[PDB]
């Protein structure tokens, strides 16, 4: 039993760029960057071009 070897296929392993693989700090930082940019668009800030819609 123990002597028997097991080969894990690469399919089960999560993708390198997946949010699960990425640490939570990076995801939170990107979300907060998006929120700050949204706030800057909502309230007219200097150097902010309104290139979006809605």
């Amino acid at each position: 039993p123990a002597s028997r070897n097991i080969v894990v296929p690469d399919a089960v392993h999560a993708k390198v760029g997946s949010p699960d693989t990425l640490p939570a700090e990076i995801l939170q930082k990107r979300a907060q960057r998006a929120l700050l940019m949204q706030l800057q668009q909502n309230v007219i800030w200097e150097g902010t071009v309104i290139s979006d819609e809605r």
Partner: peptide, 19 residues
């Protein structure tokens, strides 16, 4: 990281929403 976002409050907050 990955502990401040618990599955316990999945009904209220999405555990996958890191924002």
């Amino acid at each position: 990281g990955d502990a401040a976002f618990p599955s316990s409050l999945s009904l209220f907050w999405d555990p996958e929403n890191k924002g």
